[PDB]
Design an enzyme around this catalytic site. Structure first.
Site, PDB file in Angstrom:
ATOM      1  N   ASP A  47     -15.680 108.600  32.131  1.00 56.90           N
ATOM      2  CA  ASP A  47     -16.828 109.376  32.056  1.00 56.90           C
ATOM      3  C   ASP A  47     -17.191 110.168  33.240  1.00 56.90           C
ATOM      4  O   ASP A  47     -17.204 109.631  34.294  1.00 56.90           O
ATOM      5  CB  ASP A  47     -18.062 108.653  31.618  1.00 56.90           C
ATOM      6  CG  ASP A  47     -19.412 109.654  31.385  1.00 56.90           C
ATOM      7  OD1 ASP A  47     -19.363 110.901  31.377  1.00 56.90           O
ATOM      8  OD2 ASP A  47     -20.426 109.010  31.359  1.00 56.90           O
ATOM      9  N   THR A  48     -17.301 111.487  33.084  1.00 60.47           N
ATOM     10  CA  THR A  48     -17.657 112.286  34.508  1.00 60.47           C
ATOM     11  C   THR A  48     -18.206 113.430  34.033  1.00 60.47           C
ATOM     12  O   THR A  48     -18.479 113.656  32.861  1.00 60.47           O
ATOM     13  CB  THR A  48     -16.290 112.832  35.163  1.00 60.47           C
ATOM     14  OG1 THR A  48     -15.340 113.389  34.209  1.00 60.47           O
ATOM     15  CG2 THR A  48     -15.547 111.731  35.741  1.00 60.47           C
ATOM     16  N   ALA A  49     -19.154 114.076  34.915  1.00 59.96           N
ATOM     17  CA  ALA A  49     -19.962 115.009  34.502  1.00 59.96           C
ATOM     18  C   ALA A  49     -19.303 116.439  33.934  1.00 59.96           C
ATOM     19  O   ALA A  49     -19.707 117.114  33.292  1.00 59.96           O
ATOM     20  CB  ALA A  49     -20.859 115.426  35.702  1.00 59.96           C
TER      21      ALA A  49
ATOM     22  N   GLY B 179     -20.238 116.167  24.683  1.00 58.87           N
ATOM     23  CA  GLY B 179     -21.487 116.761  25.281  1.00 58.87           C
ATOM     24  C   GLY B 179     -21.681 116.636  26.914  1.00 58.87           C
ATOM     25  O   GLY B 179     -21.530 115.876  27.400  1.00 58.87           O
ATOM     26  N   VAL B 180     -21.747 117.937  27.422  1.00 59.72           N
ATOM     27  CA  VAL B 180     -22.171 118.135  28.936  1.00 59.72           C
ATOM     28  C   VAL B 180     -23.265 119.087  28.926  1.00 59.72           C
ATOM     29  O   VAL B 180     -23.083 120.464  28.698  1.00 59.72           O
ATOM     30  CB  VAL B 180     -21.066 118.553  29.869  1.00 59.72           C
ATOM     31  CG1 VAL B 180     -20.360 119.635  28.988  1.00 59.72           C
ATOM     32  CG2 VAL B 180     -21.341 118.754  30.935  1.00 59.72           C
ATOM     33  N   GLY B 181     -24.360 118.854  29.181  1.00 60.85           N
ATOM     34  CA  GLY B 181     -25.607 119.622  29.281  1.00 60.85           C
ATOM     35  C   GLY B 181     -26.628 119.280  28.409  1.00 60.85           C
ATOM     36  O   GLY B 181     -27.855 119.206  28.631  1.00 60.85           O
TER      37      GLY B 181
ATOM     38  N   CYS C   6     -29.782 115.110  31.632  1.00 59.65           N
ATOM     39  CA  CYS C   6     -28.924 116.064  32.451  1.00 59.65           C
ATOM     40  C   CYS C   6     -29.609 117.416  32.843  1.00 59.65           C
ATOM     41  O   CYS C   6     -30.169 118.046  31.982  1.00 59.65           O
ATOM     42  CB  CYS C   6     -27.803 116.227  31.334  1.00 59.65           C
ATOM     43  SG  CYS C   6     -26.224 117.046  32.231  1.00 59.65           S
TER      44      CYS C   6
END
Ligand SMILES: Nc1nc2c(ncn2[C@@H]2O[C@H](COP(=O)(O)OP(=O)(O)OP(=O)(O)O)[C@@H](O)[C@H]2O)c(=O)[nH]1
Ligand SMILES: Nc1nc2c(ncn2[C@@H]2O[C@H](COP(=O)(O)OP(=O)(O)OP(=O)(O)O)[C@@H](O)[C@H]2O)c(=O)[nH]1
Ligand SMILES: Nc1nc2c(ncn2[C@@H]2O[C@H](COP(=O)(O)OP(=O)(O)OP(=O)(O)O)[C@@H](O)[C@H]2O)c(=O)[nH]1
Ligand SMILES: Nc1nc2c(ncn2[C@@H]2O[C@H](COP(=O)(O)O)[C@@H](O)[C@H]2O)c(=O)[nH]1
Ligand SMILES: Nc1nc2c(ncn2[C@@H]2O[C@H](COP(=O)(O)O)[C@@H](O)[C@H]2O)c(=O)[nH]1
Ligand SMILES: Nc1nc2c(ncn2[C@@H]2O[C@H](COP(=O)(O)O)[C@@H](O)[C@H]2O)c(=O)[nH]1
Lengths: 474, 474, 474
Positions: free
Chosen positions: A245-247, A295-297, A302
């Protein structure tokens, strides 16, 4: 997925902008449909607890794995701590929950701080393994917070051996003033606790078990350092799923880490993230990962969507990444943006194998964060994000990074005064997903993906209906 | 005492209705006068902590005895607990205070609950006897309340060996960001703590010591049961003063208990109460008691004045009982009604050897009650009265009495955010008594009784002047 | 009475301005002293409920007479209504209380309005005389207020036959979630209810019984009309005491009415009022009355003190009228001004045979007024005064008087959320009077008058001590 005719919006949709229209339904009861995922994670329910240090913990891991979910151990913790967590989680019983054990030698503060660590609402006291009473909040309200616990134990508590049918336990707790019953081993030693509501749930849910029959658990690592060595160490100790898991999941470091873990042939299914693009999903699948986090954002903590134009509406990202993964035989998870059970249902219909839920679950007793009471004396917990732990890598060295890493955002996540346990939001989410399946008419989750028909709604279209009561949703 | 000419009121006076007029003064500095009492209690300051379970405790006993007062152990506690309290109090150093010791194996909650047990404002952490850091409130505010304490220890703390002159310690803490300095034994082991303000106080006050040189402490018993056996047991374990305390001190049971303790020839000075009459004081003196506690009714938690017309304005009762005791060579204590330092000064000028202070001190860190934060987040503690423990003697048996015993009254005793320690109210009271002595011109407490001239004022006469700031007075 | 030396104030004293100093005490437990009055009213406790329509009622009459007091039926009610009230009160059992009986045919509103008519907190439901369950506030909170009561009955309730020892009943209710136990006749019919607290009280108090063994009750009439005929009619129907109550008791009409009732030779002891003077008390005694009510003006709803300079501080009036009555062998009652138990104790020590309590008791469940919930949702009742009913005698005729009769004053009398029953204030008052007797050392009420020593205190002298908690006092 399939949208309604003429519903071709010029903008990416989040959960609030899209809905599901019913269809051919042959099933009647929502217990007829099964929620078991096919991604290889082994979860019988589509709920996965996020990788946040404010959500994932020993108690939440055990509780969610008991009800059929899986919990990912947060990244950047000592190997000993995660190994102890895994051993405890897989050492617990599949059916009976473990209560808060207190010896009479402990202090009252050690009780008052632990009664809210579980949704039972009343801790148990053991003397040489024998449960001698229960300790509730009302008992400790008026006593000094450092007297011996023996001054607080009350002997009015229901006892039942392990293997007792929950039907009898429910009737035993029907007239009991306390919703907590002590389950004891055949030799009299305390084996666990069976809540009346937990007794009902025991026949509804089925635990997610490993090849040995113990509760499943997942662990996570970052991309910095020797990712292969960290993954191998987490594999040595018990582990049922590996989550990288990473940004930003569309990095060269991300692909290198995925390749490093895949080359070890650990056999554990591999999960990576996060990418909100089909190209990112297919690249992560090609790199060796079996599951791609999307999902990123949309993460409720976040701040990337506010620090940067970088982000994506969650629903469209999940749809695109699900299509990309299914083109290659992979699977995807919706990550973040889960405020209501409708979010879980919408993400699941969008093609996600299951849903990764974060700060919503942190506002529960089972979350690792400690319970706080606000200005108006309402139960809540201060959930906080991973921040720099999702990013790549002396006090001056710490200050050089932390000055520019996104700040650890904190939100006041209120608990519902009645249904404050994580099992209660699990019940809400499972009921929502089963209702969605019945309305669609699908008897299983891939059928839920295949048979669902979605439509686009305006902001006013989200206004109709009844909002959730306080504390049920973030 | 002597009143002004024409001041012959037709009503009994409390503290608010009476004042002191200055007189011939030859002393200039308030350090010239001495506050040592002549009642045999050995206190170098006229402050005595009450017998309430919400005021008297290990920490308060040690702290007050260090500064020259004495603390009476509450009645109706196990002999083992009071023996342990006495051993701890007499085991401490005369000059250096003991800090809150924490091992790194302890939890953060065990710190956060103890930082407010002392006025230092920052606990110490020890590792095999070596003090390795300090733990403040600001450090534990943002951390989970169950992580290891080692995650919170900060190494910026001042060190100094025992026997160091407080002059140097004050300058060391002048630039130190933390008002706490660690005092270590010559072999490096932690011996105690010397606060900058405590360092200043070390040269001002003188501890009340026994015949061996250890801190003095007092214990109390009721009139029920074998009072002689209880007194003898309290005498076996360390004890510097015996206080027989009851709601009504003019009883036949009171006299019988006094005779029983006096017949044992323990040698410890005997204190009894409470009577607000000269006849009661002389009867208690004749029964064998050396000191008579006066106040019954002015107690801030005493509901007898409201349940019953029984009571008396404190000042007139103290004056009459002081005259009665001095006619027989005895001594008296003012009990209750101590809200302001003017109450202490007025009671002392009224003829009391020293002043017994109750719920006012309970609103401090050193009180046995745990610190709470109110709706507006102000530091306070819930002080409660002795209730049935001051009266004569199955669950039905308990309910038969408790239905008619006066309820345990509770008041919201707020701490002053700055001067919240018990030593700070000790400083206020000592400064007030010294100011009264200087205004009167008396160099010692019997001279304060002899040379004082009092006058009567109306309710409006109490309105003039400046009221105390928040938290300094009850 | 006896005052302290030098306490000769130039003003008349109320309760707040006077106190009691302790004296020679030989008794230890407060159960040793007896509270039986010698005025002939037959009350074993010195509590008498006032003649206000907002205080005196069927439920309060039965409840107070059960615990040893007496209740005066309000003046100016139909003869049939007071006869029915008397028959019901004397028809009840001496020990077991009667619960709120509901048939399943009744409506939910008929329950919700009656659960607060008694301090039990849970009504009983009967079917052909058989108690089939209990109905609590929590059960009726969520149901429509007009569904059948049978939808609300819960079968978890404790049963015990009449004559059962309260010791066993207390242990039965120890673990019962509801504080209400159903007492049944040997044939199974409902005979009454025994609250756990009521079970404890059953051994403490003794009911005030008549010559036949039934609960005592008093009735009242005005001076207008044929007072003799009204008194004779009230005598025909059950009656244990006659009270002639008027706003002004020093009138020629008052004396004529007293003579008229005395000439009938009813045998019932005669009570009249109100006069705050020795001359008035002796005139009323000479007119034929056996008891003289004292207070005119201190009534909490009496606006005479504000409409007119007419009035008197209650304590001095009681002292003077008590001396006047005891000079002639009569007795007096303190009327009004009873806010705290100290008022009862002070009036009793002043020489009153017992104390007549008004609006303080109206803020209870047993008062005839209906319970209301205020803006902040706190239990309270709107108590109102007698107004023109205490004064001498078409719509125009009504408006001619009511324009100039004092308005019906109304005050928001709050209940204590925990101890809201009238028996609970009875416990507070009895505990206060017993404490006063023990502090004085008197074993009986005439001894309480004889041995008491009183003193005068300033306004600041009333400030010391602890105020009552919310709802315990008016
Ligand atoms: N007496 C007692 N102590 C407990 C119990 N559960 C935990 N503890 C202690 O409290 C510490 C914190 O509990 P945890 O819930 O494991 O810690 P956490 O950080 O709050 O949350 P997790 O992420 O679940 O570990 C543990 O390390 C134990 O020392 C219990 O049931 N009884
Ligand atoms: N680690 C640690 N534990 C302490 C310390 N002081 C007290 N404790 C523990 O906390 C308990 C309560 O502390 P106390 O202050 O003695 O108890 P209290 O009832 O709050 O107050 P007292 O009347 O003074 O006893 C003790 O029995 C110890 O077990 C300290 O400095 N360090
Ligand atoms: N079903 C039922 N009805 C009752 C009960 N008690 C009273 N009632 C009815 O309710 C009416 C009012 O009750 P009361 O308490 O007597 O009247 P009140 O004016 O409120 O007060 P009182 O001065 O005590 O009469 C009665 O006249 C009855 O019709 C009860 O236990 N059960
Ligand atoms: N970039 C970033 N993402 C976070 C942070 N905390 C949580 N997240 C993301 O948000 C998810 C949880 O979102 P939620 O389900 O609470 O809306 C996590 O699983 C993770 O993907 C943070 O501090 N920074
Ligand atoms: N009767 C009675 N006196 C009490 C109670 N609590 C404290 N006191 C008295 O009041 C004193 C303290 O009063 P303070 O100094 O707080 O005004 C105690 O030393 C004791 O004499 C209680 O519950 N009942
Ligand atoms: N003059 C007058 N006296 C009243 C009225 N209501 C009550 N009282 C008096 O006040 C008494 C009750 O006073 P309490 O005990 O509530 O302070 C009654 O018994 C009666 O003597 C009223 O409206 N007018």
């Amino acid at each position: 997925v399939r949208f309604l005719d003429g519903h071709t919006p010029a903008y990416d949709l989040t959960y609030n902008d899209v809905f599901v229209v019913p269809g051919r339904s042959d099933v009647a009861s929502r217990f007829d449909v099964d929620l078991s995922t096919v991604d290889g994670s082994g979860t019988t329910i589509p709920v996965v607890v996020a990788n946040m240090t404010a959500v994932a913990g020993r108690r939440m891991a055990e509780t969610v794995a008991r009800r059929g979910g899986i919990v990912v151990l947060p990244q950047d913790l000592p190997i000993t701590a995660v190994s102890e967590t895994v051993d405890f989680v897989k050492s617990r019983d599949l059916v009976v929950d473990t209560p808060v054990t207190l010896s009479p030698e402990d202090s009252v503060s050690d009780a008052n701080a632990l009664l809210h660590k579980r949704a039972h609402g009343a801790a148990v006291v053991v003397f040489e393994g024998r449960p001698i009473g229960l300790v509730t909040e009302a008992n400790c309200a008026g006593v000094d917070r450092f007297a011996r616990v023996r001054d607080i134990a009350l002997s009015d508590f229901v006892t039942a051996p392990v293997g007792t049918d929950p039907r009898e336990v429910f009737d035993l707790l029907e007239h009991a003033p306390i919703d907590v019953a002590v389950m004891t081993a055949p030799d009299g030693t305390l084996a666990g606790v069976l809540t009346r509501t937990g007794a009902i749930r025991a026949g509804i849910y089925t635990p997610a078990v490993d090849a040995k029959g113990r509760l499943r658990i997942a662990a996570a690592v970052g991309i910095n350092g020797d990712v292969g060595a960290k993954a191998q160490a987490l594999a040595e100790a018990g582990a049922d799923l590996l989550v990288i898991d990473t940004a930003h999941g569309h990095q060269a470091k991300m692909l290198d880490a995925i390749k490093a873990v895949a080359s070890l042939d650990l056999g554990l299914p591999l999960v990576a993230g996060n990418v909100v693009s089909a190209e990112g999903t297919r690249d992560l699948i090609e790199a060796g990962a079996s599951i791609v986090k999307v999902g990123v954002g949309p993460g409720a903590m976040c701040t990337t969507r506010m620090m940067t134009g970088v982000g994506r509406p969650q629903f469209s990202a999940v749809v695109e990444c699900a299509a990309a993964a299914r083109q290659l035989g992979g699977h995807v998870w919706a990550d973040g943006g889960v405020r209501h059970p409708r979010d879980v249902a919408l993400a699941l219909a969008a093609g996600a194998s299951n849903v990764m839920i974060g700060s919503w679950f942190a506002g529960t007793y089972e979350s690792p964060g400690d319970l706080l009471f606000d200005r108006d004396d309402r139960p809540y917990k201060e959930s906080y994000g991973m921040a720099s732990k999702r990013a790549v890598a002396s006090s001056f060295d710490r200050a050089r990074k932390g000055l520019f890493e996104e700040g650890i955002s904190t939100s006041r996540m209120s608990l519902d005064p009645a249904r404050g346990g994580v099992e209660d939001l699990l019940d809400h989410i499972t009921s929502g997903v089963r209702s969605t399946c019945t309305y669609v008419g699908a008897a299983n989750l891939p059928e839920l993906h295949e048979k669902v028909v979605l439509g686009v709604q305006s902001a006013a279209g989200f206004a109709e209906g009844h909002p959730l009561p306080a504390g049920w949703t973030a």
